[PDB]
Design a protein around this nucleic acid. Structure first.
Length: 581
DNA sequence: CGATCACGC
DNA sequence: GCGTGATCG
C-alpha cells in the first residue's frame, strides 16, 4: 500500500480496452525513430495494467483500440509513442490529452521533460523521475520487469489523476483551446513530418566532405607556416597564445580564461597579420565539415538515405519548436559555400520538387499589430521595404538618399527594437558608442511612438500580471522583472518586449501548419510538410502540384490569422532545398 | 560538464 | 531575442 497495485497481464482483456484510459507506450532511447517499445501501461476505470509490448502490439484487439479515435487516451509525449508506433506500422488515434504539452503551456520555465516534474506542479509525488529509474547518459538501462512495470503503471496513474487539474488551470488561463486545437493537433503533424523525414544525397555530401578535407589541410599548413609552429587551432587558449603572445596582436576584448577569438574580433585583427584570415576561413570550413557534413552523415539512415529529425515541441520559452539529431533549423544559407549544403536535401521520390514558403518580416508585422503603431502599420499596408523605410525615418532622408550603410544600420536597429536591446546592446552589436545607439533608439521611437508606448506598457503589464502573453494566449512568467539586480531585471524586460512578438509569430506558423495539412487532404494533394524553420515551411510534392501549391500554400499561411496588417508569404521550388530560392 | 564559438530564424 | 551542437580541458 506504498507499492502501487496492478495486473502484470499475460494477454490483453476487454477491461484494458475501455473508451477512456491513461496510456504509456514507453520508448527509453532518446531518439525514438525505429526504437524499441519496452513496455505498456493502461489505467482506466477498471484498474491498472502492464502489458509486454510483443504481446500487446501483436494482439489485433489492442492495435484496433490504439487506432480507434473514439477510444480516448491521456498520455505524456504522445508524439514519441505515435512515431515509435508508426515505425511498426501501427496508428495511434484518440489522444485527447498530452500532459507534456499541458505543462508546457502552463509554464515553459519548469522544463517539464517527465511525468514526475509535471506531477510535482500539482503536489503529486507518487511517481519517480525517469532519470532515477533509467539512469543517465552511459549508465542508462531498461531495468528488470518488476521495476519497469511499477514505473510505467505509476506514470499512467499520475496521468490519469493529473488530467483534471491541468485542464482546470489551462481553462482558467484561457489556454484550453491552445492545448486542444493548436498544440495537440500540431503534435500529430510533427509526428508525420518526423516519420516521413528528408531524403539526403549522401554522395553529394561525401564529395563536399573530400573537397573540404583537402582545403582544410591546405589552410592548416598555411596557419602553422604563419605562426612558425604547430598548435591545436581549435584550442580557445592555444590560439590566444599564438595571436596575443607570440605574434603580439592587440587585445581588443577579454572573456574569462583569457582573450576573445570570436569572428567579431579576428576581422579587426586581419590587417595586423596574414594568419587571421586563414584562421577565419579554417573555422568556416571546419564548421561545415564537423557540424554539417560529418554530423549529417552520422544520422542519415543508410537504408533510406533519410534524416528523421525530432521536433521538441515543449522546450523553447517562446512557443517555437526546436529540432535535434539532426537540427534541420540551422542549415547554412548566408554564405554561399555553406548554402551549397542544401543541394544535398532532395525530394524523397522521382519527379518530386522541394517547395519552400516563408513569411516576410513576420516579427515586425506582428509588432505593428500588437503596438497598433499608425506609421509602422501604414509602412506594411504599402508593403514598403521596412529597413529602407526605418533608415528614411531615423536619419531623416528620402528613399533615394538611403545608402547601403544607412540600410544596414536601420536593419540592426529594427532587430534591436524586436530584441528590446539597451544603448549598450545596440552599441556592442553596431561597434558604435552608447550615446549614439541611444540617439538611434530615441529617433526610432519618435518615428514609431506606438511601438514606444507598447514597449513601456508590456514591461508594466509583465510587472503587474507576473507574465506576458501571445496572440493565442501562450504565457511566459517573468518573475525577474522585479529583481533589484539591474542585469537580471533588464534581461526580464527584454523578454517582456520580445516574447509576445517571437511567441505570436510561433503561434501563427503553428496554426498555418494545421490549416495547411487540412487543406492538402481536402484537395487530395500528395504534397506534405517536411520541415518548419520558425517563419518558413518546407514541403515536397510531385512536380504536377507546384502550380496549385504556388496559390494554396501562401494563401493558407497568409489567412492563418487576421492582423491589422497583411501577412506576406514568399515561395520558391526546385530540385533541391538549395534551388527552392 | 561549462565555456566558447558558429550556424539558423 | 530564441535555439543545437562541436570542441576543449
Amino acid at each position: 500500500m506504498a507499492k502501487m497495485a496492478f495486473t502484470l497481464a499475460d494477454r490483453v482483456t476487454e477491461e484494458m480496452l475501455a473508451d477512456k484510459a491513461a496510456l504509456v507506450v514507453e520508448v527509453v532511447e532518446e531518439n525514438y525513430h525505429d526504437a524499441p517499445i519496452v513496455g505498456i501501461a493502461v489505467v482506466n476505470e477498471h484498474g491498472r495494467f502492464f502489458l509486454r509490448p510483443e504481446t500487446a502490439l501483436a494482439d489485433p484487439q489492442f492495435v484496433a483500440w490504439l487506432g480507434d479515435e473514439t477510444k480516448k487516451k491521456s498520455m505524456f509525449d504522445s508524439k514519441r509513442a505515435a512515431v515509435a508506433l508508426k515505425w511498426k506500422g501501427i496508428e495511434l488515434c484518440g489522444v485527447s490529452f498530452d500532459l507534456l504539452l499541458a505543462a508546457y503551456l502552463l509554464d515553459p520555465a519548469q522544463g517539464v521533460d517527465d511525468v514526475a516534474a509535471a506531477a510535482k506542479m500539482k503536489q503529486y509525488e507518487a511517481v519517480r523521475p525517469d532519470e532515477a529509474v533509467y539512469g543517465k547518459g552511459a549508465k542508462r538501462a531498461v531495468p528488470d520487469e518488476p521495476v519497469l512495470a511499477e514505473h510505467l503503471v505509476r506514470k499512467a496513474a499520475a496521468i490519469w489523476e493529473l488530467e483534471r487539474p491541468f485542464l482546470d488551470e489551462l481553462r482558467r488561463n484561457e489556454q484550453d483551446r491552445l492545448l486542444v486545437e493548436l498544440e495537440q493537433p500540431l503534435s500529430s503533424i510533427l509526428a508525420e513530418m518526423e516519420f516521413a523525414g528528408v531524403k539526403v544525397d549522401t554522395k553529394r555530401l561525401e564529395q563536399m566532405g573530400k573537397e573540404l578535407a583537402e582545403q582544410l589541410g591546405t589552410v592548416e599548413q598555411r596557419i602553422y607556416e604563419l605562426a612558425g609552429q604547430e598548435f591545436n587551432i581549435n584550442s580557445p587558449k592555444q590560439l590566444g597564445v599564438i595571436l596575443f603572445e607570440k605574434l603580439q596582436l592587440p587585445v581588443l576584448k577579454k572573456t574569462k580564461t583569457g582573450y576573445s577569438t570570436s569572428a567579431d574580433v579576428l576581422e579587426k585583427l586581419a590587417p595586423y597579420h596574414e594568419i587571421v584570415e586563414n584562421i577565419l576561413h579554417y573555422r568556416q570550413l571546419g564548421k561545415l565539415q564537423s557540424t554539417y557534413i560529418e554530423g549529417l552523415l552520422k544520422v542519415v539512415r543508410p537504408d533510406t538515405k533519410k534524416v528523421h529529425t525530432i521536433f521538441n515541441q515543449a522546450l523553447t520559452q517562446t512557443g517555437r519548436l526546436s529540432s535535434t539529431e539532426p537540427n534541420l533549423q540551422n542549415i547554412p544559407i548566408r554564405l554561399e559555400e555553406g548554402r551549397k549544403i542544401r543541394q544535398a536535401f532532395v525530394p524523397s521520390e522521382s519527379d518530386w520538387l522541394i517547395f519552400a514558403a516563408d513569411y516576410s518580416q513576420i516579427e515586425l508585422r506582428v509588432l505593428a499589430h500588437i503596438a497598433e503603431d499608425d506609421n509602422l502599420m501604414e509602412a506594411f499596408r504599402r508593403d514598403l521595404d521596412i529597413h529602407t523605410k526605418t533608415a528614411m525615418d531615423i536619419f531623416q532622408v528620402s528613399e533615394d538618399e538611403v545608402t547601403p550603410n544607412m540600410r544596414r544600420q536601420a536593419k540592426a536597429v529594427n532587430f534591436g527594437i524586436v530584441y528590446g536591446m539597451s544603448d549598450y546592446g545596440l552599441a556592442q552589436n553596431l561597434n558604435i558608442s552608447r550615446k549614439e545607439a541611444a540617439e538611434f533608439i530615441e529617433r526610432y521611437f519618435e518615428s514609431f511612438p506606438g511601438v514606444k508606448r507598447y514597449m513601456e506598457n508590456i514591461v508594466q503589464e509583465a510587472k503587474q500580471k507576473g507574465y506576458v502573453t501571445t496572440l493565442l494566449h501562450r504565457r511566459r512568467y517573468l518573475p525577474d522583472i522585479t529583481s533589484r539586480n539591474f542585469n537580471v531585471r533588464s534581461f526580464a524586460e527584454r523578454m517582456a518586449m520580445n516574447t509576445p512578438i517571437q511567441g505570436s509569430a510561433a503561434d501563427i506558423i503553428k496554426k498555418a501548419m494545421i490549416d495547411l495539412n487540412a487543406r492538402l487532404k481536402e484537395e487530395r494533394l500528395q504534397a506534405h510538410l517536411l520541415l518548419q524553420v520558425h517563419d518558413e515551411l518546407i514541403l515536397e510534392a510531385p512536380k504536377e502540384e507546384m502550380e496549385r501549391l504556388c496559390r494554396l500554400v501562401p494563401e493558407v499561411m497568409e489567412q492563418a490569422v487576421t492582423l491589422r496588417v497583411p501577412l506576406k508569404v514568399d515561395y520558391h521550388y526546385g530540385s533541391t532545398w538549395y534551388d527552392a530560392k
